Design a protein around this ligand. Structure first.
Ligand SMILES: [Br-]
Length: 182
């Protein structure tokens, strides 16, 4: 079911936890830097050949990182987890994305950047909290095995496709937006 994820074709091998954390921080910094000169008054400005506004772009990352953190926190607390979310299934990502916009896009860029920054720090704490086995071997978290229909994904794959991969593709999109609008 997780193959419905839009970055399922951008998987990566990692050597260890440190390599994973370093890549998340590097790609996050390059992505977030692009918003430094985007004014709040243009956060909802839509460019023609770009799907999302700057706020919707940030809202998407806040949305997904909030979900990954929730799956693990809920499991840590002994709960049974529904993925990708309680309201939407893996074949309803389009609706989940609109929910991200409705839930988060109205916030200021400053507030969205603060939330994403906090989430990157929490994801690093999560990586540090799991053994190398829990992170890199299959069948270590019930939430990661929850939707499997074809190939199994280890915890690190879920972290990677929701951080390193979109930070790269959405950085391309926000740069395109700035070239047009600014
Ligand atoms: Br976009």
């Amino acid at each position: 079911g997780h193959h419905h994820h839009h970055h399922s074709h951008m998987l990566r091998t990692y050597e260890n936890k440190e390599e994973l954390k370093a890549e998340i921080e590097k790609t996050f910094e390059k992505y977030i830097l692009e918003f430094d000169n985007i004014p709040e008054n243009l956060k909802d400005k839509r460019a023609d050949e770009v799907d999302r506004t700057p706020a919707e772009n940030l809202a998407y990352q806040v949305g997904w990182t909030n979900l990954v953190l929730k799956w693990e926190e809920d499991e840590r607390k002994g709960l049974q987890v529904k993925t990708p979310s309680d309201k939407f299934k893996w074949n309803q990502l389009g609706e989940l994305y609109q929910w991200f916009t409705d839930t988060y896009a109205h916030l200021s860029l400053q507030e969205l950047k603060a939330k994403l920054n906090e989430n990157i720090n929490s994801i690093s704490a999560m990586i540090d909290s799991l053994s190398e086995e829990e992170l890199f071997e299959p069948h270590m978290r019930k939430w990661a095995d929850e939707a499997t229909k074809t190939a199994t994904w280890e915890v690190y794959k879920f972290i990677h496709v929701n951080t390193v991969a979109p930070f790269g593709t959405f950085r391309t999109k926000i740069r395109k937006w700035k070239k047009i609008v600014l």
